[PDB]
Amino acid sequence: AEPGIDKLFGMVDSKYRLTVVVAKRAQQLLRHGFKNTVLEPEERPKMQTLEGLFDDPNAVTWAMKELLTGRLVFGENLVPEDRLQKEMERLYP
Amino acid sequence: KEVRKVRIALASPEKIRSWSYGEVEKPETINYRTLKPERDGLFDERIFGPIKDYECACGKYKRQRFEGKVCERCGVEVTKSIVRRYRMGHIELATPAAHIWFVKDVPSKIG
Amino acid sequence: PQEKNSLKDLVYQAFLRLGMEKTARLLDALKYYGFTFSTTSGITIGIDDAVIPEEKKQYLEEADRKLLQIEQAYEMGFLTDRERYDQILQLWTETTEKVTQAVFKNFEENYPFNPLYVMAQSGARGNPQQIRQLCGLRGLMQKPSGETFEVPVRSSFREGLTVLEYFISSHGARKGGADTALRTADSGYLTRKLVDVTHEIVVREADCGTTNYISVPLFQPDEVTRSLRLRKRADIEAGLYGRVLAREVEVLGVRLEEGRYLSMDDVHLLIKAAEAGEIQEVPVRSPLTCQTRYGVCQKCYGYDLSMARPVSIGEAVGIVAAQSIGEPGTQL
Amino acid sequence: MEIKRFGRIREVIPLPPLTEIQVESYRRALQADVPPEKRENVGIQAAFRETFPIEELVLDFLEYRLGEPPFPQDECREKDLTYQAPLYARLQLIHKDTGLIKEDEVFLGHIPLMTEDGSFIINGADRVIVSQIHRSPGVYFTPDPARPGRYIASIIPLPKRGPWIDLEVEPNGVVSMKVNKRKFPLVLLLRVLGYDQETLARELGAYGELVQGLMDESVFAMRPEEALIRLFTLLRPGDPPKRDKAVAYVYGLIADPRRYDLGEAGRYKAEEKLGIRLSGRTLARFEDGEFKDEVFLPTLRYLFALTAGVPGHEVDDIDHLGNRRIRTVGELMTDQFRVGLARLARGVRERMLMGSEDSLTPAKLVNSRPLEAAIREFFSRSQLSQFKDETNPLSSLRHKRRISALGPGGLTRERAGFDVRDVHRTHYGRICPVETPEGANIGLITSLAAYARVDELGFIRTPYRRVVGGVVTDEVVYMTATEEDRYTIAQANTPLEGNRIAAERVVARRKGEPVIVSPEEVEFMDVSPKQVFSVNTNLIPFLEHDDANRALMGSNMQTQAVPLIRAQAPVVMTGLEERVVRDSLAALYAEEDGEVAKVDGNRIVVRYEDGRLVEYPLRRFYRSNQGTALDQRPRVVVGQRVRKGDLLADGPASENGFLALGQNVLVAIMPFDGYNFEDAIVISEELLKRDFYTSIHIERYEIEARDTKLGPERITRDIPHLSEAALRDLDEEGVVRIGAEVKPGDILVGRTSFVKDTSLRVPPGEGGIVVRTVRLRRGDPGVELKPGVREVVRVYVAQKRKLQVGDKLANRHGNKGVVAKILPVEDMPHLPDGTPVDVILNPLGVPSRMNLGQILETHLGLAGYFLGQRYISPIFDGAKEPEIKELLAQAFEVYFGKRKGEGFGVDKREVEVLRRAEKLGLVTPGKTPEEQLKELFLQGKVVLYDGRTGEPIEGPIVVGQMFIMKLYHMVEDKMHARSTGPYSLITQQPLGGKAQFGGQRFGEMEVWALEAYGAAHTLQEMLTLKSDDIEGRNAAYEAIIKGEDVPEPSVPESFRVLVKELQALALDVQTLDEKDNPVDIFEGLA
Amino acid sequence: RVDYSGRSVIVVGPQLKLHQCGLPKRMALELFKPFLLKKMEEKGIAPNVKAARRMLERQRDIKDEVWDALEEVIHGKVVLLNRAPTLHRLGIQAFQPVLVEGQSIQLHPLVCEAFNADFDGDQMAVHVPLSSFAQAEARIQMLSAHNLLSPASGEPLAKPSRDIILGLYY
Amino acid sequence: TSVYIEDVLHEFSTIPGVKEDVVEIILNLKELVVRFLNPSLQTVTLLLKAEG
Amino acid sequence: YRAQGVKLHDKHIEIVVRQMMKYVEVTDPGDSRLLEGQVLEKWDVEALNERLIAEGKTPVAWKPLLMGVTKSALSTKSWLSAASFQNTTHVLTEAAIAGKKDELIGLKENVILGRLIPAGTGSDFVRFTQVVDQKTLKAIEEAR
Amino acid sequence: PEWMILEAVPVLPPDLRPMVQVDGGRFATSDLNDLYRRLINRNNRLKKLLAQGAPEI
Ligand SMILES: [Mg+2]
Ligand SMILES: [Zn+2]
Ligand SMILES: [Zn+2]
16 A cells, blocks of 8 residues: 555544645645655665666655645635745746 | 525526627538538637637737637627537527427426 | 454454454464464375264164154155155255264364364355355255255265255255346345435434434344344444444443444444443434435444444545445345 | 268268258349249249339339359458449330330449359458348247237238238127227228138138127128228228219228338248139239238138137247248348339439430339349348357357347347247257357357258258158158148167168157157158257267267357368268368369369369369458458379369368368366366467467458548658558558568558548557558549548568467367366376377366267277377267277287387286276276276377376376367467557547557456455556556556556546536535535645 | 456555556556557567557457567556446555466455455456556555545555464564 | 568469479478587588479 | 345435425415425425415425335426426426526536536535645735 | 527527548537528528518418
8 A cells, every 4th residue: 555544544533634744745845846845865766677776656645645734724715825826936947 | 706506587688688798690500621610609719708718719819818809800708618508599489489398398497 | 373353353343443454464473473384284185084873874764764764754744745844854954954063063073173174163165054065964955946855865965966956956955046137236226215315315414413322122022032122232332332422421331422432342332331231222323314415424323333433524424334234135 | 090980870962052051042133044934933023013013104124133243252352342243234215105105224323242152242251141040031920928718810011011910809709900009890891802701601600609709790781992091090090082082092001012012932821721713922912993802811811720729720829930030131132122122213213203204214213222222231230130150160060050039021120029039849950959159149040951942932951761661762852841840750869770770669759849750650750860950060070979968069169160270070970071172162173084283282283084274362361350360281293193072172171171170189188286277278388389270360450541630641651750660561552561470569550641641550469460451542443432432552471380389279069178287298197108199178068068079089099099090979969988998909009019019018007097996996906907908998098208207107098089170269469568558539438559458447446356355556557547547547557667566546537527527517515524514625726 | 438448356465565466468468458559569570559559459369569569558557447336436546567477467466355345256457557647646646656545534554464464463 | 580581572382383382491490400619610501402 | 225235324215215205295275385286395385374374474384205116306496307208398487487586506417507516616615615725824814 | 688689690600510421421409500591491481571572371
């Protein structure tokens, strides 16, 4: 199964809230290109290639691990969508 | 932005003509020599919208620099072609005709 | 040893204690090791492996003499025609049961690691009936109509069936095929209608705050018993497992909170409390008692069974229902 | 390769020509060789005799002739043609007033001839017409479900050849008659038939008080004329009861053979049951101006008999095979031909009114198209006529013997409950109780039993041996089901010394029920235990050790069993296999004793004792209707002696003149790392090495051209915007060069229109080697194209598909399996001598299905592997355990004998397995390892070493050759993956593609699946972005391409479209928020 | 009928974990073709999209680098495997694609009971959740290993099936 | 590893005057055991012309 | 279901039978919009009653009504679900003669649409959530 | 209630009624195109008949 999926289901009042959180976070991670990650360089999910270890392309895995760290804050109406998007896009192109 | 409900209701000729953007006054359609629609037909851009994205019939305005603009030469709005799945027409009747549903659906609503 | 049920409750208790991921890795470990040891085991079906009990021969002697005496009882005519045929049916049912019991007894006694026996016993593949037909005598086969043939396929699958026996076998066989294939197209016949009525019900509220609850009775007066008998084990579970209480429940000197989601352990101690007679009913929230116009609150529904935690608010509980009820329609 | 015969019981008669149920029937209908002077009143002749003479001018019938087929079967299959014969009919017309006689032979179009193998070729497609099951004509009495103590009579004619007449007796006792959903006192109709009250009262009076209930004074006070008038008033209210028209109604309803035609076999049923005779196939006749009955009086007589309970009278089982006819091919053909002729008669009725009354010939009158259209409709677009299962010779062989309850003039899918589907007691020897197709439509398509054959009457007849006292007799009486229920028929299993029975007690079957009888009580005997099932089921060895369901599936899988390049005859067979190939006409045989002068792959020419030189053109890799290649490989050396009825060349799926639907492989039955899980099958790569299970499949592709005003279409090599390297394997004509290797995307046939390209390239699914191409230009010699088709070019692309991972494997015992992982020779269980197992089977697949036939076949596959001999084990009459153990003893001594001879002791691993087995208790404890292994091998089990571990597989496993065959359900045809796919023009859901595949049906059940999951984004994406939506699918492809993981469906395309659709009907469908604020779902634009 | 999808005869895959399943290289390619074009854009295999599909145009166009890119993109992604007919919620389940030789879907032996699927010629449709939203909820609530218990009964519908019970009981 | 027969366009063809088809001929050719005397040599094209 | 060895939770069955016990007939129209014999949902007649009884009007004498699964699915407020079954002419007609506020409250109601079905993800309680980090929320806190 | 009778008949969008060229120049138009076509074939023949002032029958 997915790593820490238990703790992930525990963090949320709804498994589907976990779904939307992980998903939207993955959308943020792809729209910003993982430069907005809260994962430390050591915590970055790796993948084995013929060359060597590279960063995990999948944003969902990244979001789930980020959520496992607990450094992410999720909830309803945390910040107006416009201002949120503009700030996150201000920090990261 | 959040469509919570959907209201079905009867439409007055006013509301019927509201969604309409031109009167289909011809039974004409696509001919063989030209793949473009015929005069005020079912596919006429003057009623239902442009075949191509942000491009009128004649081709005076060909990009998104113009949007919402109605060409003075052919009478076509410069919007997305996808509107040809949406934009409505209408057919004015000399004698008003009863909707066959309300007529023949059992029990007959009109009846 | 580890059988279908034991591994079932193993994966379950792992799921509710150890968690999902550890239970999945558990599952793949049981898979890999169980497989490598499935090929190490060298389990194999042979004609000699399909051991016929001597008890089968003996039982054929006994069944024969008894049925002959029964036909004498028809010549005397104490019974009616239907009751003669019923003294035949009654005979062959318990005959097949005694023969089957003889098969598995002879197995676990003489051949504990018999391929057929370990498959049936583990619940891997097969069941008592099929192993009976294989090893012991094949069960009595039905006539074209509702009645069953007086002559059963007493020849085993190891010895070989007689041609006529194979015919009367093909009767009930083709009937069974006609019954199992008829529901293939009706597989979504129920689920459709159910969806048509349960598409609009989901978990919208975390708690509708309804005071109303249903009380599932842990005791059903079984018609044949005519007494306040403790209802079936699985029924209590399927009617109580993963359910919120609108009233606190104090049983076995243990406190079940008001508004607490019940677990299988909770239901178990409730049943043990019922055996000691602590409570006859359980005050429990239900979809029936929710106030939500189009849906069920989180409390009223109870546990989401798929993940064994409180139902995720927003779950298509209605479609989950339509599919949960429509799925076994084929097996019915 | 030597064969060991098993079973003591001898088949006293060989099997009938397994195709004669169709062959002899259709030939009976045609009677082409039979001269017009000696043609019996059956089939085509019967229809001519029933239809003619037309009594207006009198168009009579003289004779009819059947010309030779315009084209041979080969060319018929070649050019989308019907293998038909020109139908002619010499008729004479006589002017009733003048007395002049004119005569002429009219060409009544064509009638589809039947091939030698019992099949047809309709529009170039090999089509077999399955025989039909239907309630036989004649008279049938059945107990009233509403009224216990009374019985309902029911006069049933041929389907669509008259109404069902039911003679029902009410509680009052009055006789009633039900026709066309109308009930009336039969008294009336009886009086119509010129019957005095006296005749009824004397003919029936000895049967009881019911006859008094018949008596009606008002009916008897009026002469038959007035009673007829009254009847016409009762059956057609409003219609004026004018005498002649009323007489016309009664006559047409009953006395007219053209409108009402009771079956000839139904005539035999009425005759035999009622003990009377019919002058013609009518309930009554019209003579001298008055009606004269034939059927009603005896029917009412037997009815009142059954009601009163008179001995010698029995009620009718409507599902009795003696009461249920088999409308064979010839009968169905001549019935649609009879309808066609009826429309010829009506047409003529419309012809004689127009033009010259005097100037008429047996030509100017005849209108042949209703006939031609009837026949063509019946052979092309009927449910009884289906595509010939040419998968394997046996598949065709059974599709011929296949009998349906469905089809025109029969039952529907709702008109058939368990009552019709369930095997009746009389199917024994007449119908396979096992050959019903699994899944839906089961119980309705019961195939014909092996020794069973259909008479002229259409009743299935099974052969029996009449006996004399204790002695049995070689005399073979073929009996219908209705006759069978009057005798006692012993089984074939009983011990027989020469003829005579030597059994004090005998297991027998009497009128359906099994009874133990004495030799003197025996009357008849089963010819063979093989007579009970179809050919397929009869090919299955140890069927008596197989479950009826799984042998149903086995017998059915025989149909989709695929011929292989090294197709080996089964290690364990039933002896019916040898008959199959020659009865299936797959393999070509010798017509006389002689020497083979020329031996070739394409042809085999033989010189006979006559001195005549006979050439046999071998059908080489002709594409089956189901895809498998039909090839014929010679078996006789150049210039060698051959007898009459001897093999010259193998057929498809055939080895040495046997039926080889697959290849028997050394199968070890054991779990392997879960690779054989849930019927999955593990396989040695050794099988792929020596090309075992290599199926040659030919797919038929085609391009048809049509003419448009901008430009027509043509088959050419000149194809726009494509490299010559892409046209490397195309000849000048645009046809792919014979012998080329094409892949999905490669071009097969060219075609251009408006210049853009619209040629069909090789479909994404199938591609391979081309063996034969057929170029059908417009108006080619004997070629018929669809209207508007400028040219048809059909390429037959073959390929030798090996046994890849996933392909559907199966034995004859219902073990449907899937290729798990083709493990190399190394990591596979292997014999102590080093022999690597060919196939690993999941043992789990045996207990639940209760089919030990595979287990036994394995046990004999072992002995046959070590003795190099294949075994004939007849069904039920097969070798029991002891003989198998003996075979395994000799074969054991061959197996371990080499090791013992070389100087080899027993392996430590072997002794270890013997330890584990001694713990398991399979082998006897304390004995020497050679004896332990002896007894172990007796059990059909061997010490097997895991090739990957080396450590001996603890607990010995069963090994031995099993006739596993590859099935038509192989993978490459089924594999179907796709990123995107060209969307249909009628609906913007994806359907098929030139370079890509076709969309995947996301059924409503899957929609509910995603719903329940709460995957609203996945569902939205699925139904819209992944299909129906275009504007969102472009964003899907583009964003996923750019790597953007968020394809955006802000507004549902289906919804806005729905809103507009609703608005189109002038129904306002305004969308509002909680605020009731009109939220523009079109996001403007409206 | 859906675009981004597939189907084939199913085969039991013992080696693959529950969260994953075996896809044919052909199937894995066609399923994630656009994904492949993207990752090949990332790696040094193909210049742009057109040249990427042209790099995946014919059969011999396949290469080590390409299959490696596929392996890279399906890493962390899942496919919705579905059996005919769908009877319940677990009638479809997500599995991390694992490239496998052959042309047949390699299915996990455990979920068979949940799919009511038997390897006697059964064919399973497969799908891909393109959106990372869809992809998320796929490998969060539609993942086979995330639906171990049946939503119908609460009983483990992912319990050790036949062969496993056989081995373990032995 | 390879087979080319004159006047034979594909494996599923059949040669005039030859009993075995090209399929079965190739099947027989798969049973051909060829010993390379020299280890460095890795390919040999054997020819065959026969008639009568 | 127990008879065939099938054990499914009582919950689901309770869901469906609830969806069958949702409609009620009218004994007396009272001061409501309803009339004698009209079929509507229990919750809606309860809301109508509690709105009328708190207004000073005579409530609806509602008679508890049990209809089958398809009879409950046929007489639903969801005229989309109903006009996706049979005679959609009639459904749309009877629903258009009266301006019907069809809440997109059903999954079948919303699948025809294409929007996020009110289930799992698509549920309003779950759908509207946001994810942020401290590096973002600090900058958020700055300007606000 | 007067709204039931429509004196103006709405026309569905062109794309929802795809008069498109399929295989071999075969324009497979939806039935609605021909339907509105006939509707105008009667409509304009009614307005022109009002202009003409054709006799009542
Ligand atoms: Mg299956
Ligand atoms: Zn313009
Ligand atoms: Zn609630």
